[PDB]
């Protein structure tokens, strides 16, 4: 039905997000190895604030900025678990 | 430099994720209104498990399944904050 159809669309969106998250993971691993090689820190609060700034500004809804902010903070933390460990 | 270039790629990926999350939000709001209209529950643990099942199975890395599972659980919770409130 309509709900079945919509859930299938959500499945497609979920998979797209998984692909992008994986792409993002590959990118942060590369940044991490470069930071290691150059003796630069991996933890950068300034960079996190900068990303949250344009994401909350560009947020088109329906999610409130507060939610977008929290979701991305979770993504950033999941990434640290890489920039400190497995990198490129 | 290389880090600057990579951060710009991360910015592009972040924005793509924001778009998909917003698309996802619109979809769940629609499902929510249909559930309300049909007298169906909004909270469905069975559905959440089903999504985590194919996402962890299809996970290509570098993120571990455990991380993918947690990130999506956060996305599902952020969505409830909609399926219960603002819907289509």
H helices of B1-88, in order, are 2-38, 45-58, 65-83
Which residues in chain B have their CB less than 8 angstroms from residue A55's CB? 14-15, 18
Do residues B16 and A20 touch, judged by C-beta distance below 8 A?
A: yes
A15: how many CB neighbours lie within 10 A of its CB?
15
Closest by CA position to B72, among listed A21, A62, A3 = A21
The domain that contains B55 carries what CATH number?
1.20.59.10
Tell me how many domains chain A contains. Answer: 1
Torsion of CA A62, A66, A70, A75, to 10 degrees: 50
Spatial distance between the Cα atoms of B20 and B49, rounded to a whole number of angstroms: 21
**B47 by DSSP, 3-state: which?**
helix
B53: how many CB neighbours lie within 10 A of its CB?
11
Spatial CB neighbours of B32, under 8 Å, sequence gap ≥ 6: B42, B82, B83, B84, B87, B88
Q: How many angstroms separate the Cα of B48 from the Cα of each of A1, A34, B53, B68, B74?
A: 19, 37, 9, 13, 11
- A53 at B interface, C-beta within 8 A: no
What single-letter DSSP state applies at residue B39? Answer: T
Suggest the residue from A4, A6, A19, A86 to mutate for an interface test with chain B (most B CBs closer than 10 A): A6
Domain span holding position B57: 1-88
| Structure method | X-ray
Suggest the residue from A1, A5, A13, A64 to mutate for an interface test with chain B (most B CBs closer than 10 A): A13
Spatial distance between the Cα atoms of A64 and A16, rounded to a whole number of angstroms: 21
Suggest the residue from A4, A8, A24, A55 to mutate for an interface test with chain B (most B CBs closer than 10 A): A24
Dihedral (CA of B43, B47, B48, B49) sign: positive
Closest by CA position to A13, among listed B61, B36, B55 = B55
Cis ω on the peptide bond leading into residue B62 (within 30° of 0)? yes
Contact (CB<8Å) B2/A86: no
Spatial distance between the Cα atoms of A42 and A46, rounded to a whole number of angstroms: 11
Residues within 8 A of B (CB atoms), A 7-26 only: 7, 9-11, 13-26
Contact (CB<8Å) B78/A55: no
Resolution attained, angstroms:
1.8
* Among candidates A15, A63, A81 on the partner chain, residue whose Cβ is nearest the Cβ of B58: A15
């Amino acid at each position: 039905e309509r709900i079945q159809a919509l859930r299938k669309e959500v499945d497609r969106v979920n998979r797209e997000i998984l692909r992008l998250l994986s792409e993002r993971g590959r990118l942060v691993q590369e940044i991490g190895r470069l930071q290691t090689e150059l003796g630069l820190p991996h933890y950068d609060p300034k960079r996190e604030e900068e990303m949250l700034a344009y994401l909350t500004a560009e947020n088109p809804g329906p999610f409130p900025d507060e939610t977008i902010r929290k979701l991305f903070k979770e993504i950033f933390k999941a990434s640290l678990d890489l920039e400190e460990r497995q990198d490129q």
